[PDB]
Amino acid sequence: TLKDITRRLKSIKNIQKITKSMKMVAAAKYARAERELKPARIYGLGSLALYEKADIKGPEDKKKHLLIGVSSDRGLCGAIHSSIAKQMKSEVATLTAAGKEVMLVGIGDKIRGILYRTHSDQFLVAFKEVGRKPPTFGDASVIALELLNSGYEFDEGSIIFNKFRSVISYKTEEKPIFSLNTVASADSMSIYDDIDADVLQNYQEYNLANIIYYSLKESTTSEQSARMTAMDNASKNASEMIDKLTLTFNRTRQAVITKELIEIISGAAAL
């Protein structure tokens, strides 16, 4: 039918326009994202420089656990939220199977949505309105505050995010987060001086905030890129469908002209 094809064509045309605009704005944001990422990357890795140079093995004995997942509040980026989701839920399954209770923070409305009916019973808190604005340090300070005011002093923890590799690839990484107890117990920390419960406590809290900030920056970037390429794919596929439906539209309109002409001719021939 000619009018059906006309309507479907107009729909796919405005959809392709929408996806092209989204690709444009997503690339525009990704510009500033990867501009800000590099100094923040130097920063957030200089923070972990100690837990690297000290080789904190981690608690092999402790029971509870805290699991953070970094995402945004906007879908339509790709397999970002799905990747974080699958890794988080697999990891929770294997930790509860091993006799270790775990409770989970979700930064981003998307991860909370996609994992809430899955593991609501094992869930601490969630945060929203992350992803619209370029994440800053204030984000990390707030998330760390409500991670500490939670009263849930975790044995250990792991943050899960999408390490930005570059414009096309991202890797679901899991960074470790230690507690005061074993960072104090770690014999490697006997080379550092002037340390006791108080200063290690302050340092652990501030490093929690730092690693959350660096992870947010690693995830904001590595989402605008995924969104840009996904919208590129969407616009390309929409234009392919537009071309094929346009072929079918021309075919149908030629057939319509032929059919009406044959009607008129057969009607004239009966006189």
Binding site: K3, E260, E263, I264, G267, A268, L271
Partner: protein, 161 residues
């Protein structure tokens, strides 16, 4: 199924009751059930008085089970009644034609066998000018007015038919 006849019913109620100008209703090829319901709803609403005639609406009905010529000329019959009430009465008449596409399609059905080559879609070669000779009698002259409320059937919601 969009609500044309119920719309013309609302219009009949409000306008024809709030008017003093001898309305006319021309039923051009519409359902007999709806025509009977409209008649009986006009009677009980006082617009038609069977006793001591004070009625203010004249009804003309050429319905669906009639041949195409009848459904093509019943709109002209309604026209003629309203034209009397304007020409030789000075009144400002209302003319509810429902439905006029039935008039057009009855024209199509007469042209079918009237021995004439068909135009586009299937209508007559004489569609535009015959519907025009009909629709130009509906006008406001210096003698009176005929405001016409016409319900029009659009086949398959096309609007380009």
């Amino acid at each position: 199924g969009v609500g044309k006849t119920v719309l013309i019913m609302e219009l009949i109620n409000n306008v024809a009751k709030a008017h003093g100008g001898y309305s006319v209703f021309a039923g051009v090829g519409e359902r007999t059930r709806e025509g009977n319901d409209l008649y009986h709803e006009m009677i009980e609403s006082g617009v038609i008085n069977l006793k001591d005639a004070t009625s203010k609406v004249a009804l003309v009905y050429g319905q669906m089970n009639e041949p195409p010529g009848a459904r093509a000329r019943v709109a002209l019959t309604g026209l003629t009644v309203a034209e009397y009430f304007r020409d030789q009465e000075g009144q400002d008449v209302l003319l509810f034609i429902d439905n006029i596409f039935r008039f057009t399609q009855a024209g199509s059905e007469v042209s079918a066998l009237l021995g004439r080559i068909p135009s586009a879609v299937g209508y007559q070669p004489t569609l535009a000018t015959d519907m025009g000779t009909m629709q130009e009698r509906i006008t406001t002259t210096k003698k009176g007015s005929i405001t016409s409320v016409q319900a029009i059937y659009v086949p398959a919601d096309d609007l380009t038919d």
